[PDB]
Amino acid sequence: TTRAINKKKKFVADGVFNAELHSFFSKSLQDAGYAGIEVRRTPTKTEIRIKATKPQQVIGVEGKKHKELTQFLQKRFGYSDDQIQIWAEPIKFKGLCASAQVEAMNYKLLKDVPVRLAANYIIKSVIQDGAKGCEIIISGKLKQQRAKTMKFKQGYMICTGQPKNDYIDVAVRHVFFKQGIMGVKVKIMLPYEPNPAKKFGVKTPIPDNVIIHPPKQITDDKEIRTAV
Amino acid sequence: QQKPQLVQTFGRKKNAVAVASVRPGKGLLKVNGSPIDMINPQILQAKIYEPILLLGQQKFANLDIRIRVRGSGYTSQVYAIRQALSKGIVAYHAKYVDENSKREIKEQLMQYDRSLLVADPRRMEPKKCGGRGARSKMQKAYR
């Protein structure tokens, strides 16, 4: 053992570790769509899976960003080279990831592409990938020196209830302009996926859906005493 | 292991719990290892004597009953003892006597009071922020 630590104080410390990682990766990884991080912890090792849209930029040109990252975690915490492992995992459906899509419109808005068009492009993408519904909020100066707030909805959307925390995926970004910070939220309501067979949506249905299942007519042979 | 002639019932009010154990013999009531006589607020000792007087001593002279009580405060404790004792006799008459007697003592008791065989569902209410209590709130200035 290393040190005997408070199960409470340890666990909080583990969560704080996780959060520091998430801030670190969202901050230093900003170009390739970065979604999530999953941390397994072995007496031997610490395994970090970076779930991302463009794994290719996580690795870089033959581990330029990979080696950079790995060494960053090394100098930061102190770690043996066998003690740290970084994997990058692809998110198979980019349209179901918010942080990704908000990065997309971050990008498109930097290139001066107009609001409504961009918003539409992403929304159409998101629903093209099978998401039931999506919404985008852009706030701040758009038109003029006086702040505006513009919402774009299409499809199906829930806000309130525990289902919110399940089906709805949200991300925000701060976007920088000569004029100041403008900001952008993306809410993608995910679809309902009944089978563990795929990484998709939500495994548990909206508590509202009630379905009656009408009866069937099938093959019936009886067993009867013969008459001679 | 020789399974004893034991019966064990529990009883409850607020945070208080009473476990009464019933075995046959010359009747004792000892609560926490002491006669009812010494239960702290004197007034409500009659509360414990209630189901005893209701059933008559004749049922109780046949049985030694020992009730250990740990719980919240004096009164709830008294009610827990009450409860455990009451449904304790009932459980005895269930295992070792005919069912009929269990039934008629059940009815006998509950016609007098239902708090004997049924527990008070009430517990404390947690406190809502912005108040000195679980409803009442910080004073407000309108004008």
């Binding site: 249905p205 859906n209 009630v210 009656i212 299942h213 | -």
Partner: protein, 64 residues
């Protein structure tokens, strides 16, 4: 406050609609029937639906 909602009444209508021959004046039967017959995400929900559907079985026994 015991007024029953859209989801529940649509549900009950459907459950009787397809299943009337299977259904009983007993709540406890009809709730199991429902459970087999349908996807209901909540215990509470299923029970509300079953109760209303039972209620409607009784109302059907009386007439239109």
């Amino acid at each position: 406050g015991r007024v029953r909602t859209k989801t529940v009444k649509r549900a009950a209508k459907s459950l009787i609609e397809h299943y009337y021959s299977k259904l009983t004046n007993d709540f406890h039967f009809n709730k199991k029937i429902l459970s087999e017959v349908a996807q209901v995400p909540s215990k509470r929900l299923r029970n509300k639906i079953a109760g209303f559907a039972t209620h409607l079985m009784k109302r059907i026994q009386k007439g239109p």
